[PDB]
Amino acid sequence: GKVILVTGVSRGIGKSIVDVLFSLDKDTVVYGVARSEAPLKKLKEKYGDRFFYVVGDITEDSVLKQLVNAAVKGHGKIDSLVANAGVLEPVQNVNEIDVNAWKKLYDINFFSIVSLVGIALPELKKTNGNVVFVSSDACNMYFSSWGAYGSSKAALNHFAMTLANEERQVKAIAVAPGIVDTDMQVNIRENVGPSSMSAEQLKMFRGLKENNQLLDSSVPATVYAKLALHGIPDGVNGQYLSYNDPALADFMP
Amino acid sequence: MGKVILVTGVSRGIGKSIVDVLFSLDKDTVVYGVARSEAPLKKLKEKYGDRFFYVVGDITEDSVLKQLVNAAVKGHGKIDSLVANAGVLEPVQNVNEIDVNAWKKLYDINFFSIVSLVGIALPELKKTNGNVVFVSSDACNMYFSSWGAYGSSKAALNHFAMTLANEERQVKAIAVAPGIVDTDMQVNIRENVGPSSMSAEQLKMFRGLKENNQLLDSSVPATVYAKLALHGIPDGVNGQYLSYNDPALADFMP
Numbered sequence A: 001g002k003v004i005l006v007t008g009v010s011r012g013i014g015k016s017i018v019d020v021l022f023s024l025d026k027d028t029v030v031y032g033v034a035r036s037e038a039p040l041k042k043l044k045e046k047y048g049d050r051f052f053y054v055v056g057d058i059t060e061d062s063v064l065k066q067l068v069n070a071a072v073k074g075h076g077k078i079d080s081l082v083a084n085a086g087v088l089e090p091v092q093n094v095n096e097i098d099v100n101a102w103k104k105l106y107d108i109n110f111f112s113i114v115s116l117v118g119i120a121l122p123e124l125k126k127t128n129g130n131v132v133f134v135s136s137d138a139c140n141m142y143f144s145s146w147g148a149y150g151s152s153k154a155a156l157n158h159f160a161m162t163l164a165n166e167e168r169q170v171k172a173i174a175v176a177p178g179i180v181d182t183d184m185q186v187n188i189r190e191n192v193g194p195s196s197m198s199a200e201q202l203k204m205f206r207g208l209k210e211n212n213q214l215l216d217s218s219v220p221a222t223v224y225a226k227l228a229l230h231g232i233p234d235g236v237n238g239q240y241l242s243y244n245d246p247a248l249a250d251f252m253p
Numbered sequence B: 001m002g003k004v005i006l007v008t009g010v011s012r013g014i015g016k017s018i019v020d021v022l023f024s025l026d027k028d029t030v031v032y033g034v035a036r037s038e039a040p041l042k043k044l045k046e047k048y049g050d051r052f053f054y055v056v057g058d059i060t061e062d063s064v065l066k067q068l069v070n071a072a073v074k075g076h077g078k079i080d081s082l083v084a085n086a087g088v089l090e091p092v093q094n095v096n097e098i099d100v101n102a103w104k105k106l107y108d109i110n111f112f113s114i115v116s117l118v119g120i121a122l123p124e125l126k127k128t129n130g131n132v133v134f135v136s137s138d139a140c141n142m143y144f145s146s147w148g149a150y151g152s153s154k155a156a157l158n159h160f161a162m163t164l165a166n167e168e169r170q171v172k173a174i175a176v177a178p179g180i181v182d183t184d185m186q187v188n189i190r191e192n193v194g195p196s197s198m199s200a201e202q203l204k205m206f207r208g209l210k211e212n213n214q215l216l217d218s219s220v221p222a223t224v225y226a227k228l229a230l231h232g233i234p235d236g237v238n239g240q241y242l243s244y245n246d247p248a249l250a251d252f253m254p
Ligand SMILES: NC(=O)c1ccc[n+]([C@@H]2O[C@H](COP(=O)([O-])OP(=O)(O)OC[C@H]3O[C@@H](n4cnc5c(N)ncnc54)[C@H](OP(=O)(O)O)[C@@H]3O)[C@@H](O)[C@H]2O)c1
Pocket: A007, A008, A009, A010, A011, A012, A013, A014, A033, A034, A035, A036, A056, A057, A058, A059, A083, A084, A085, A086, A087, A108, A134, A135, A136, A137, A176, A177, A178, A179, A180, A181, A182, A183, A184, A185
């Protein structure tokens, strides 16, 4: 009866993370959070007493404490925390940077999680649970106009390594899902791509779709689900890996 | 004349020593510094004269960043390098005692203030094929106890050096760590924030580092940051993260 908290579960990898979690087990309870009310009420209508949703922006700590205390006031237990919520904008070249937009990007993919763990860490230590970060391949690779988003996940990799080395009662990990057929790649192909992104990387993100090499949302979500359901191995605690790493072969579909 | 360099945090530690080395190897270089303490800046003005200019204020405000860049073009007409030597260690705290508002102010000094200054000066940096030098730290890769916000902010700055060097081929960015230097920050580690938020084993590593005379003088790494701004960043290490004593950065050593 593991209690798993997942962020941004209204679309993309988030909604599938709770979909795979409800497929491998029938006693696991998931507390989700997002900003769109319609797709979150559909998840509870579909799963009933196994899913509970909080509609709000993770940048507001008022709804972060709403998500954590609801799991304690509902089940008195906090096992896993999968940080699967983030934005991509601002997608802009270094010659056209808005710093206040960069902090807005950092307040969702990094500062939102540092505050989220600090609120749920006392409950996570009581179960010796796992903290799984949903990182990205842009933390060590160059991507055009991804200066904010690329360094966004690089700081998450450091926060994953620091958390695993500081409080060893819990275990932290940061795993990149690769390239997944979500609405983010839709934004890369039909909006922020032709505007500010270059030509070489753009035709790659679009050529990888027509030839059908884009992963479905449930392929990497199964890795984050099993890592949140069975636990993180000891030899990879705090490291940064990808979903298809041989060390995580026991978490593949 | 020669080149014009912009160095941040020219008050304490390494930032002041970078100014001393830049004037030590050249006589045409003029440095435009910025810092919040007027006491050590007005002293550097009377030591070098018309080779040094300063702006008193915090780098978190864009009005100070623009006042430093605009003064460098109305005075000498160009900007040839950028030395981002401004950082803060606090808040040092445990994961169970995290203050998010205090974590942001570190990022707004060590990261968001730098990414704001690079773009304001980017139109001038590209006109001279300049070199942007980032002063990072060893905490971007290794783990340090309770160095949560500091170690993670250097990791974001290192990625920005690679992004800046790959997007604008007219500029050259690098992120060099000075190792562990005998500055005012290491004094704060062994005495202030040490017996407060950090472990015991890592402090016996840092306090034993001073008792072993292993603390580098700020003259050694500042020479690497200064020579990289004068002679320029090589192409074989453009956008990478290195240390001061890297074999690729040997020609920038004293
Ligand atoms: N797709 C890829 O190629 C790829 C690659 C590398 C990493 N990732 C990472 O995988 C994770 C999910 O994939 P995705 O981004 O592609 O799916 P997505 O559909 O683009 O969005 C992911 C979720 O994040 C939620 N979210 C964003 N900001 C929020 C906020 N301020 N408050 C509450 N919820 C918020 C969104 O819910 P609402 O819309 O309702 O606010 C959304 O459901 C992301 O973290 C992404 O960085 C994806």
